[PDB]
Write a protein that binds this ligand. Structure first.
Ligand code: NAG
Lengths: 222, 191
């Protein structure tokens, strides 16, 4: 029943610093990997930073520096230091844990928004009455491995989670609606039946190709 | 006496990352121009000393290490920098003398079903002291619970293999890599 709690916000006009306290239960920051992903308002969500157990850390390629992730084993609380920012930095910040082989970004907190290989989803946005089989296809460019694919569920007002981690074997709480099977560069996401919580946005996912993790823009399914 | 370093370079079997082969050279002479010139291995870029001056340098003994890693990992294999494999599996002590050999033998490395004989290690409590291996099959627990030494959700098995195939994007197919180190001892240098 591992859970996560953090809080930050405000700052309608620029504030140089801001610190959010990612406090965890069931695991420690020194235990395994820690990750951060920010979701811009109505835009694609991208990777920013991961710390490696033992001290090593990498930051986002888009904006090198200006951040500082520090791992505190004393408090069990993860803090991400800011120096100062500009516009477009604002987004809801999620702190999450990853292991990248049997689970990709397994458990996420609730998050909050600060203020101041490519995957392309061919089907696009689909609206459909409940009761019909649906499919989603993810297009790539470097014909990577099937084991590196992941797929995610997102519902408004709910922090997104995962359904299948490897693209072949479904994670805990298997749905008999979604399925994972891929050939070549395109990996099929087919759906059997539609449920009220099922009508939602979905993102193709790739992990392990590099220390940085890439996401897709996402498509709306309803 | 000719050295078996050419034999080591031209070897059918390389061990995986988690356990790297090690060979030593004694009372022998090694012509380094065979490595200096064009080889079936494409890349010869390395840092130890000036490669041309190698002839006149007196050196005691030679260490030979080989393994199989990924194409991007070939970038990170260099010393003085931090990577997931390097910090956890194979670490090069900085200021070392001797240098690195890199190439892609994709034709033999790739397998139709996937050559899974090659392995890596991605779970450890802390970092790794340079020039030291931990070939441990021990179940790894990270979170609060110890798992009683059994497979569980929080703990995980640290060892897991790659995924290969005959046709793949460049830079991700396995790369065979051999490295060597040079040093001096008080003993008569047998080189
Ligand atoms: C292996 O390949 C090298 C590269 O040309 C060659 O010099 C050598 O004779 C071959 N055989 C052995 C046993 O090293």
């Amino acid at each position: 029943e591992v859970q996560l709690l953090q809080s930050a916000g405000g700052l309608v006009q620029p504030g140089g610093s801001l610190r959010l306290s990612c406090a965890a239960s069931g695991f420690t920051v020194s235990a395994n990997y820690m990750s951060w992903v920010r979701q811009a308002p109505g835009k694609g969500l991208e990777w920013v930073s991961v710390i490696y157990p033992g001290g090593s850390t990498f930051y986002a390629d888009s904006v090198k520096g200006r951040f500082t992730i520090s791992k505190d084993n004393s408090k069990n609380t993860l803090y991400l230091q800011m120096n100062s920012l500009r516009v477009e930095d604002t987004a809801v910040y999620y702190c999450a844990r990853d292991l990248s082989v049997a689970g990709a970004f397994d458990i996420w907190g609730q998050g909050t928004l600060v203020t101041v290989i490519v995957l392309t989803q061919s089907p696009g946005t689909l609206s459909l009455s409940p009761g019909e089989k649906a499919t989603l296809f993810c297009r790539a460019s470097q014909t990577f491995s099937s084991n590196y694919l992941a797929w995610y569920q997102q519902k408004p007002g709910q922090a997104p989670s995962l359904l299948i981690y490897g693209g072949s074997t479904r994670a805990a709480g298997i749905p008999d609606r979604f399925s994972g099977s891929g050939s070549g560069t395109d990996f099929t996401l087919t759906i059997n039946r539609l449920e009220p919580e099922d009508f939602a946005i979905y993102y193709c996912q790739e992990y392990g190709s590099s220390p940085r993790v890439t996401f897709g823009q996402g498509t709306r399914l309803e | 006496n000719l050295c078996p370093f050419d034999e080591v370079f031209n070897a059918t079997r390389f061990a995986s990352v988690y356990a790297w082969n090690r060979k030593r050279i004694s009372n022998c002479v090694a012509d380094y121009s065979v490595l200096y010139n064009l080889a079936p291995f494409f890349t010869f870029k390395c840092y130890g000393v000036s490669p041309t001056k190698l002839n006149d340098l007196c050196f005691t003994n030679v260490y030979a290490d080989s393994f199989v890693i990924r194409g991007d990992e070939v970038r990170q294999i260099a010393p003085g920098q931090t990577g997931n494999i390097a910090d956890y599996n194979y670490k090069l002590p900085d200021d070392f003398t001797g240098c690195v050999i890199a190439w892609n033998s994709n034709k033999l490395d790739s397998k139709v079903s996937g050559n899974y004989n090659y392995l890596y290690r991605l779970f450890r409590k802390s970092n790794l002291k340079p020039f030291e291996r931990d070939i441990s099959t021990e179940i790894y627990q990270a979170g609060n619970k110890p798992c009683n030494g059994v497979a569980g959700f929080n703990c995980y098995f640290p060892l897991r293999s790659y995924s290969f195939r005959p046709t793949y994007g460049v830079g991700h197919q396995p790369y065979r890599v051999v490295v060597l180190s040079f040093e001096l001892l008080h003993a008569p240098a047998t080189v």
